[PDB]
Amino acid sequence: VESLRDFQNKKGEIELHSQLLPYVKVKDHKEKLNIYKEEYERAKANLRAI
Amino acid sequence: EKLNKVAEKYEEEGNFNLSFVQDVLDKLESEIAMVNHESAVTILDQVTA
Amino acid sequence: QRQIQNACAFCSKERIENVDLPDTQEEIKRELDKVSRMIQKAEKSLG
Amino acid sequence: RELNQTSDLNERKMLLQAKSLWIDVAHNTDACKNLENEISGIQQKVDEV
């Protein structure tokens, strides 16, 4: 019974971790998006002013 | 809410990454699969009675 | 030449192309870390 | 058997390091080839002038 309870608890824990990891995944994706956007919109502004 | 709180916890520690999360997953998997897990409870009740 | 010497310091390229491995260094590092985790797990489970 | 498996894993990690170094070799060769192409172009300009 102890082994079974530990099994259930750790299954719940790993499920929670797999659920959460997309948090930082989406944060990193946003960083790749937002930073690139700002930089190269500034770049397009440079060429438009030129 | 709980996942956001754990997100704050991990990112304060820097743990919120595929590396740490996957390592915890694999550690618990190793501890579960190797340690193979009503019969117990029922037999215990019979024993006690 | 320097990286060739580093690679030839252990094993030779003949076996290097015999084993699949990512070109990105980050995946190599992650696999190395996982190998280290398995090292520690075996050292502690088997004493 | 876990000890043998982990010995194989450690040899695989040595292979990981060696493959990383050979991939660095490949990248440096590619950069050298690109610089050689630049040499070819600039000397073609020298020939034109």
UniProtKB/Swiss-Prot annotation, chain B:
> Which cellular compartments is it found in?
Nucleus; Chromosome
Q: How is it modified after translation?
A: Sumoylated by MMS21.
Its assembly, as annotated, is: Component of the Smc5-Smc6 complex which consists of KRE29, MMS21, NSE1, NSE3, NSE4, NSE5, SMC5 and SMC6.
Q: What does this protein do?
A: Acts in a DNA repair pathway for removal of UV-induced DNA damage that is distinct from classical nucleotide excision repair and in repair of ionizing radiation damage. Functions in homologous recombination repair of DNA double strand breaks and in recovery of stalled replication forks.
Q: What information about domains appears in the record's comments?
A: The flexible hinge domain, which separates the large intramolecular coiled coil regions, allows the heterotypic interaction with the corresponding domain of smc6, forming a V-shaped heterodimer.
What's the further remark here? Present with 892 molecules/cell in log phase SD medium.
Q: Which family does it belong to?
A: Belongs to the SMC family. SMC5 subfamily.
- What is this protein's name? Structural maintenance of chromosomes protein 5
Give the organism the record lists.
Saccharomyces cerevisiae (strain ATCC 204508 / S288c)
Q: What is the lineage of its organism?
A: Eukaryota, Fungi, Dikarya, Ascomycota, Saccharomycotina
From Swiss-Prot, chain D:
Quote the subcellular location field of this record: Nucleus; Chromosome
Relate the assembly described in the record.
Component of the Smc5-Smc6 complex which consists of KRE29, MMS21, NSE1, NSE3, NSE4, NSE5, SMC5 and SMC6.
According to the UniProt entry, the note on domains is:
The flexible hinge domain, which separates the large intramolecular coiled coil regions, allows the heterotypic interaction with the corresponding domain of SMC5, forming a V-shaped heterodimer.
Summary of the function given for this chain in its UniProt record: Acts in a DNA repair pathway for removal of UV-induced DNA damage that is distinct from classical nucleotide excision repair and in repair of ionizing radiation damage. Functions in homologous recombination repair of DNA double strand breaks and in recovery of stalled replication forks. Probably plays a role in structure.
The entry assigns this protein to a family as follows:
Belongs to the SMC family. SMC6 subfamily.
Any other comment in the entry?
Present with 339 molecules/cell in log phase SD medium.
Task: Please identify the protein, giving its name as recorded.
Answer: Structural maintenance of chromosomes protein 6
The primary gene name is: SMC6
